[PDB]
């Protein structure tokens, strides 16, 4: 397929792989959340890789991210990344999510698809920041 498509799909694949590594360092609630995110990323790769022929994530999936963001915002009040080993993994995933976002933005600009996926990745990176801070705050 097209180079921007290949690069976007590949970087999304890298993202879900790093999340797949991170989910072994968090508790069962966060593990459940990360695996839903992996399912969403797989859905996104389908849409992007097929240049929009196959449907991607719904608005509801973004709405689901917003609900979690609002939840963890309640717990979180300039810090170095990786206060703990666990939070460090989520900080890595966060930056990979932004890297995937940049790749998807190129596809959106060129091909006019993946706007919803881009929004999802942006919100995801925000959630990952929050999750990393919640872990650190619990561990003082």
């Amino acid at each position: 397929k097209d180079s921007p498509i290949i690069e976007a799909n590949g970087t999304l694949d890298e993202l879900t792989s790093f999340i797949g590594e991170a989910k072994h360092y968090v508790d069962e609630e966060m593990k459940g959340i990360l695996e839903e995110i992996q399912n969403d990323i797989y859905k996104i790769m389908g849409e992007i890789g097929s240049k929009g022929k196959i449907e991607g994530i719904s608005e509801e999936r973004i709405a689901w991210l917003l609900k979690l963001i609002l939840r963890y915002m309640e717990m979180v009040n300039f810090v170095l990344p990786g206060g703990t080993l666990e939070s460090a993994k989520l900080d890595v995933c966060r930056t990979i999510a932004r890297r995937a976002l940049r790749k998807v933005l190129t596809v959106t600009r060129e091909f006019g698809i993946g706007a919803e996926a881009a929004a999802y990745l942006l919100a995801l990176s925000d959630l990952l920041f929050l999750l990393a801070r919640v872990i650190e705050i619990e561990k003082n």
């Binding site: 608005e59 709405a63 917003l66 609002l70 959106t108 919803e116 929004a119 925000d126």
Partner: protein
Amino acid sequence: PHLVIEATANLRLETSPGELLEQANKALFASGQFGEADIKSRFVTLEAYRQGTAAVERAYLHACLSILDGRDIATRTLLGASLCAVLAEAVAGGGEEGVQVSVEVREMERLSYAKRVV
């Protein structure tokens, strides 16, 4: 940013206009794009409206978010999606069928924009 929410008079909401504006502002802030004090929102009830041409009872809910240009399409889309989720959840019902909920995000020209605090 400036948010306008328009609702037809026959639309039933799960909350008050005030509570809806509060939810919208919290959702907008949760994007991380804006300072708290900069989010200005207003609610308008449409008393004189017509949807379509058919003799069917319908209600709708529309929002227009205006932001200064410079943000990318991911951010503009996230803002619209966030608001749309808040508005759709607020809808109890209206008319004799489903309620159309829609959100536009538009950009204000930053270079010519004028702002002051008195």
